Every structure is written in C-alpha cells, then in structure tokens.
Amino acid sequence: EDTITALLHNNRKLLEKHITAAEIDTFVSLVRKNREPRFLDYLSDLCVSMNKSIPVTQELICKAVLNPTNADILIETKLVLSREEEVWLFWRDSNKEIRSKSVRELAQDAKEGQKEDRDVLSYYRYQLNLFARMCLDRQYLAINEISGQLDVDLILRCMSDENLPYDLRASFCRLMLH
C-alpha cells in the first residue's frame, strides 16, 4: 500500500499516460467488492488530488463508478418523508437487499457498541469525500448526476444540526463546496 501510495504522488504524465481504464476498473470493481474503505480513499486519491483538478482521469473514473451497471457500491439517500426527522440512507452489507431501518440511530451508534453499525457511517464519510473529490472544478457530465441527488434542501436538512457527526459533518460541507 505504501509503495503504491508513493508512486501515486502528483506526477502528471504518469496519471495521463501509464494509467488506463482497465486497471482502475479492476480497482473500482474487484478490490472494492468486499470491505475496507481505505481502498476507496486510495481510489479518490488517484482521482484528482495532485494539487487541483487533473481533468483527464476524473472523467474516466466517474464513468467507472457512477454508471448504474456499477451500482450497489455507493450509498444513496431518498427522503421517504416517513415519521420533522425524515431522512434515510440505504446500504447493503455483502449479502442481501436494502435494509437500513434508521439513520438517527447511527448517532446513537456513534459512541460505542457495534462494529457493523460503526463501519457504515465511516464508509459513508469516505464515499462523500470521493464525491467531493470527484470533479470539483469543471467535469460536467458527472456533476449532472450528483445534481439531482443532494440537490438543494436535502444537503441543508442533513447539515442543520445533529447529535454526533464530526467528520461526516465536514463531508457534507465539502460536497457543498464543489
């Protein structure tokens, strides 16, 4: 991990020459199917962050992730207006269908008690960070897909006040800022 981190420094011509869609697609699919959102962090590091907005690779990675054929990796929100205090984010865990059952209980799970209920918000924070670091300046064909989601009121209602998010709380602002 450390050697491939040091190879993946600023390095413009390496990003636009020796990196193709196939190897990152295997990195997007095969490594990412199981667990461990540190690989999601390294995928986000490969995407843009040299200093500001490598444009050639950010429009290759987005079509590797944001297509509906590559769904069930990211976590989406719906605002099903159930029963003030209506918001839900939906995640699957390696075997079966949507089940979420809450998001306010994750604030109760933010202190201690579970591991499968504590990995979910960390994975959500990291994929929020990847969405913020996806285009962030000029790439338009994949900023339109993330325009409908978290559009106007959903990003503000999740970032009004809550018991105990700190890093995800900053992740909402970071996705706001771009």
Residue 21 · residue 64 · CB < 8 Å: yes
Print burial letters for 28-50: b (CB count within 10 Å at least 16), e (below 16). Answer: beeebeeeebebbebbbbbbbeb
Distance CA 149, CA 78 (A): 8
- Resolution of the determined structure in angstroms stands at 3.3
Distance CA 149, CA 144 (A): 9
Nearest to 28 by CA among 127, 119, 97, 118: 127
Distance CA 35, CA 2 (A): 19
Nearest to 161 by CA among 91, 90, 84, 109: 84
**138 labeled part of a ligand binding site:** yes
Place of tokens 């018991």: 163
